[PDB]
From a paper:
Mammalian DNA methylation patterns are mainly generated by two de novo DNA methyltransferases, DNMT3A and DNMT3B5. The catalytically inactive DNMT3-like protein (DNMT3L) has an important regulatory role in this process by acting as cofactor of DNMT3A or DNMT3B6–8. In addition to CpG methylation, DNMT3A and DNMT3B introduce non-CpG methylation (mainly CpA) in oocytes, embryonic stem (ES) cells, and neural cells. For simplification, we choose the DNMT3B–CGA complex for structural analysis, unless indicated otherwise. Similar to the DNMT3A–DNMT3L complexes, the DNMT3B–DNMT3L–DNA complex reveals a linear heterotetrameric arrangement of DNMT3L–DNMT3B–DNMT3B–DNMT3L.
To gain a mechanistic understanding of the enzymatic divergence between DNMT3A and DNMT3B, we generated the complexes of DNMT3B–DNMT3L, formed by the MTase domain of human DNMT3B and the C-terminal domain of human DNMT3L, with two different Zebularine (Z)-containing DNA duplexes harboring two ZpGpA or ZpGpT sites as mimics of CGA and CGT motifs, which are separated by 14 bps. The structures of the DNMT3B–DNMT3L–CGA DNA (DNMT3B–CGA) and DNMT3B–DNMT3L–CGT DNA (DNMT3B–CGT) bound to the cofactor product S-Adenosyl-L-homocysteine (SAH) were both solved at 3.0 Å resolution. The two structures are very similar, with a root-mean-square deviation (RMSD) of 0.27 Å over 828 Cα atoms. The interaction between DNMT3B and DNA involves a loop from the catalytic core (catalytic loop: residues 648–672), a loop from the TRD (TRD loop: residues 772–791), and a segment in the homodimeric interface of DNMT3B, known as the RD interface in DNMT3A42 (RD: residues 822–828). Each Zebularine (Z5/Z20′) is flipped into the active site of one DNMT3B subunit, where it is anchored through a covalent linkage with the catalytic cysteine C651 and hydrogen-bonding interactions with other catalytic residues. The orphan guanine (G5′/G20) that originally paired with Z5/Z20′ is stabilized by a hydrogen bond between the backbone carbonyl group of V657 and the Gua-N2 atom, while the ZpG guanine (G6/G19′) is recognized by a hydrogen bond between the side chain of N779 and the Gua-O6 atom, as well as a water-mediated hydrogen bond between the side chain of T775 and the Gua-N7 atom. Aside from the CpG recognition, N779 forms a hydrogen bond with the T7′-O4 atom, suggestive of a role in recognizing the nucleotides at the +1 flank position. Furthermore, residues on the catalytic loop (N652 and S655), the TRD loop (Q772, T773, T776, K782, and K785) and the RD interface (R823 and G824) interact with the DNA backbone on both strands through hydrogen-bonding or electrostatic interactions. The N779A mutation led to reduced activity toward CGA, but not CGT, consistent with its role in contacting the +1 T on the non-target strand in the CGA complex.
Numbering used by the authors:
A (entry chain A), C (entry chain D): 563 to 853
B (entry chain B): 179 to 310, 320 to 351, 360 to 379
D (entry chain C): 179 to 310, 320 to 348, 361 to 379
DNA sequence: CATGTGATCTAATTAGATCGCATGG
DNA sequence: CATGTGATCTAATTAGATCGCATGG
């Protein structure tokens, strides 16, 4: 729907990342070769921000709370060529029995993405390119998936990370990016099965692990809670560097802020599958400058 | 918001959602008796309404929003009435060049708690006004211009539970005469 | 004292590393360009062995507890061209007020190095090259330093890591390596000030830090126990990746076995200063094969 | 260690460490009572002795080691006597080409705990033998051959807490001069 | 009939502070 | 007068297991 841009007419991309987490979006864009002119990140977890500032060396402007962003801020920090976000799903995902849905607890933070998206939307008569994307879990009440699609005026496309990573991760993706319904294809550098993500002298019991959450129980596979890795003939859980390779992040990406195992899995459990996001952001290279 | 001369004041095209006020606007006299094609659309559960639906229902001059008054028979969470009101509102506003006056207002009959209150003011870009009681978010100027009697909320905090809507905001609909046709 | 070897008669080096820790000896040797034909490590800490096997991909033969190494083992695993070790100092250093000397507790483990050194020594009539080294703290009783020098029949040379690292670390080095008494010179790749070891957006209060132990209190500097780093205006302790840069190890060297901050400091706290060891092993590349 | 003809048996030259066995070795006639140049060197404190001392003290045919005999006159931990005995033994050992028989012995007067015993037998490359009693590590074949009375010490742990170890000095006669 | 971008309660376990003094500066 | 290849005890803080059920398979 968006017209093609001549290569010389392309300019660096200006991104508004809400609920930025560990700066997955910025990481994907930089490894795609896209020149990033501005990356505004709304995030409130110090450890998450620590990862983004350190691994990206202050190229990210943090704007702490999304509920404290004003219409003036969107115009001041703008214009934005890309508005990405993943709302917290602890009150939306079916894994939580006491989830409060979309209108109570943490689910209502979705509407903050809806609110600031309309602020960032080009005014009537501005045919400049503009792309956005919203991600959330599949295991979500039908009323929530219905209402989210209504506020965004768009229907989601499910992309399971199982096709490009070593883990189950079924996620919904609202957006207007070029070719989102396109078939997901594996890359030459995608570590597809668990053995590709492990360290030396470690053996993988399974070829593909179940969905990884923030809790340590999701590492133990199946309904009989098996340790997914054997080392020196002893059952052992995944290592943080291995969880990173499963998600597609660079090794030691979450080796920040003296974080131990528990904290690093908490940040990765919320994050995006990098090869999935690369699949989504790939056709943006034909609209923005490269480097 | 320039004042419009009386000889060209068209009748209101009202969109009333969650709470129907045709009896109010007819009593005050913005809606004309022999109505046969109405100038007030009323929808209750907007969950399955699209932008095309609002655009199909003709251009609107007033978009009214309201929460259920002091009722327990609410299937919806309190915030649901606000977010859905904000969604349809963007569907109703016309082209950037505003030909005629466009008004909107949202009324809460003491149903939104503090946490939901700051959410409403953020999305509606405006702090509410209390009318002795109901809270009113409105771009209608005289509803933001005139000052009703100040009220200590600390006493009205416990007065919300005493309940266990039509003449209060009737003074709110009043200053819309200056923009539309007066019917008697 | 030992003659020079033609660049053709140079064969790969065979090393017996006792109390190997986190494979500092192997790391230094491989960073000097020396071919390592065999590296036998005596270590009992699981995490320490995990570091050595993972970071060096199984080039190190681990031979558990030193007290179970027999004379037949030294001859089976031999011959050895280099025997290096630093025994535990928790019963030798002055930081422990309840130390037991080198005759009780864990101080006895020195004599295990002395025992296996004589086994590894070339018999009379073998003019082949043979080098050895023993490291320990300077804060031991003079009665201990005396006896250690008697069994090894050699006097130690003290080298403080303050000259090549960002930390005070004064250690004794018994051995027969070429040029151990030579003046310690700094390299261009040596991170001499604490700032050079910190991450982005972090500010160092001091140029040099206290001697780093396994306990978290040695990170707090001075008699008033002040945090050594400031970031975002708030005071903070060193990070594991920064501790590694202080010791001269590669970044993320101890990012294994899901180790938290406490475990990683326990390994680094008792390790060797890499640039100090490099200064000691540097004249060995004129006796063994290039790479 | 082959037996030596009687007409060739030179007299001993021993090193006694921490405990002097001169009077006990005299009684078995391993040395002239007329001392004139000493045939036995005695050192009570080894701490400051170097290999150049033991080498200058003449080649040795026997090196003796012994712990204090429960006298509580111990200003030193018990493992010290073992480690220091091992240190001098390598100083006193001759070149690999053996010109003559060399014997060594270390005895324990029940002052080494189980932890020190496992270290002792490991450094001396042989398990000890108990002569009813003292523990003995030695390369003298008859000590590790003649089966002394074998009764476990599960009784003599609380129960216990020099003529028999004089009889194990005897088998050195087949190798050195006999004096009467 | 196996599954899950989580919350909970409790058990291990870890953080952090205090302790300690011979000894050159 | 300030320092340290640590051990301790106690205080916070995890690690781990159980919980939970609509739903395609
Ligand atoms: N009120 C708020 N304002 C801004 N960010 C918030 C927020 N409440 C929660 N968040 C953040 O939103 C994130 C949602 S989890 C999604 C993480 C991110 N998509 C990634 O790639 O890693 C969390 O990191 C959480 O810290
Ligand atoms: N009985 C034993 N046998 C072998 N290694 C032992 C041991 N007792 C302790 N050790 C190990 O000896 C090490 C001494 S700390 C020295 C570590 C090493 N010099 C380095 O550069 O990292 C410790 O890691 C400890 O685990
Ligand atoms: Mg879509
Ligand atoms: Mg020397």
């Amino acid at each position: 729907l968006y017209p093609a841009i001549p290569a010389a007419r392309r300019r660096p991309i200006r991104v508004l990342s809400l609920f930025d987490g560990i700066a997955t979006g910025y990481l994907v864009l930089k490894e795609l070769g896209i020149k990033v002119g501005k990356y505004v990140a709304s995030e409130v977890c110090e450890e998450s921000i620590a990862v983004g500032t350190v691994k990206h060396e202050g190229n990210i402007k943090y704007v702490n709370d999304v509920r404290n962003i004003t219409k003036k801020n969107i115009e001041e920090w703008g214009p934005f060529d890309l508005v990405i976000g993943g709302s917290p799903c602890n009150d939306l995902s079916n894994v939580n029995p006491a989830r409060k849905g979309l209108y109570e607890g943490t689910g209502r933070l979705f509407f903050e993405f809806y609110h600031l998206l309309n602020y960032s939307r080009p005014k009537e008569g501005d045919d400049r390119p503009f792309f956005w994307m919203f991600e959330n879990v599949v295991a979500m009440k039908v009323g929530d998936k219905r209402d989210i699609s209504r506020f965004l005026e768009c229907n989601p496309v499910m992309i399971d990370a199982i096709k490009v990573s070593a883990a189950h991760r079924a996620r919904y993706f609202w957006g207007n990016l070029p070719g989102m319904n396109r078939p997901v294809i594996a890359s030459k550098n995608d570590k597809l099965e668990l053995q590709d993500c492990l360290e030396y002298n470690r053996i993988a019991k399974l070829k593909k692990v179940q969905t990884i959450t923030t809790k340590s129980n999701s590492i133990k596979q199946g309904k009989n809670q098996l340790f997914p890795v054997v080392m020196n003939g002893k059952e052992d859980v995944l290592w943080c560097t291995e969880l990173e390779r499963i998600f597609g992040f660079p090794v030691h990406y979450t080796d920040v802020s003296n974080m131990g195992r528990g904290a690093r899995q908490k940040l990765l459990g919320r994050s995006w599958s990098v090869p999935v996001i690369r699949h989504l952001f790939a056709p943006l290279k034909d609209y923005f400058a490269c480097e | 918001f320039e004042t419009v001369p009386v000889w060209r004041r068209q009748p209101v095209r009202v969109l009333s959602l969650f709470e129907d006020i045709k009896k109010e606007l007819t009593s005050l006299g913005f809606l004309e008796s022999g109505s046969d094609p109405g100038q007030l659309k009323h929808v209750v559960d907007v969950t399955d309404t699209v932008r095309k639906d609002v655009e199909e229902w003709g251009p609107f001059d007033l978009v009214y929003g309201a929460t259920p008054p002091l009722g327990h028979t609410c299937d919806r969470p309190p915030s649901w009435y606000l977010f859905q009101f904000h969604r349809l509102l963007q569907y109703a506003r016309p082209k950037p060049g505003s030909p005629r006056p466009f008004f909107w207002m949202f009324v809460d009959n003491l149903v939104l708690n503090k946490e939901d209150l700051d959410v409403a003011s953020r999305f509606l870009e405006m702090e509410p006004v209390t009318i002795p009681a109901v809270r009113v978010w409105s771009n209608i100027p005289a509803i933001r211009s005139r000052h009703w009697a100040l009220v200590s909320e600390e006493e009205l905090s416990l007065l919300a539970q005493n309940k266990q809507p039509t003449k209060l905001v009737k003074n709110c609909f009043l200053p819309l005469r200056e923009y539309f046709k007066y019917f008697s």
